[PDB]
Amino acid sequence: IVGGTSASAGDFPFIVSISRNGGPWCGGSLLNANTVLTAAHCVSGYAQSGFQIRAGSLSRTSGGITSSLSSVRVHPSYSGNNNDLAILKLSTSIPSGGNIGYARLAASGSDPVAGSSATVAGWGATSEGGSSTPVNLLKVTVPIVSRATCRAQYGTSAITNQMFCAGVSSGGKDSCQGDSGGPIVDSSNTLIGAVSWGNGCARPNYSGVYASVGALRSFIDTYA
């Protein structure tokens, strides 16, 4: 997270950190006791044994409940940056209680509304190309960017209705490398997307691009 602040305990009860090879890698969202929603790019094709999930902590290294993965299901039509979600099944159940809860999904057919304030969180880089990855969770609030503008920025073909965009025109607030798969929520903390891709991080006029929960609910609902 670029241009963010320290998350507080309980801000995202459902957020998980996803390590790979014992190192920071991605974020995700706990949907229920044995299921995490993350970005397909975080897990597609990779050895599933390299991953570990941690829930119930502001730290990605300590505290909470951990689990290995039983299975990975990438969206059936994942293609390029498109349909960039995967459903993970957990070998250790993660009961709700305390700072653990489950995500509330955006309504089916919904699209985030341009100009509305969204909050994204993760343990990714704090600058584009940055060396340091935060131990404690960061968050940042950015406006949704209209898809028409996002298409002006990246090309019409590059932004589909399975994606939405968020960021500030003059740059400086965004998700970044290591935040992929983690949540973006609306002002009521409803899960509207997962961090997906972008042309660097926090660049002026290149919005962050997010996998859209509202558009992907039929894959999410069926396997969650």
For the annotated catalytic residues, the residue numbers are 41, 84, 180
Query: DSSP 3-state assignment of 99?
Result: coil
- Closest listed residue to residue 41, CA positions, set 28, 53, 54, 32: 28
Query: DSSP 3-state assignment of 116?
Result: coil
The pair of three-digit structure tokens given for residue 33, joined into one six-digit string: 């006791």
The CA distance from 124 to 180, in Å, is: 8
Buried b (16+ CB within 10 A) or exposed e, 116-142: eebbbbbbbbbeeeeeebbeebbbbeb
Query: DSSP 3-state assignment of 67?
Result: strand
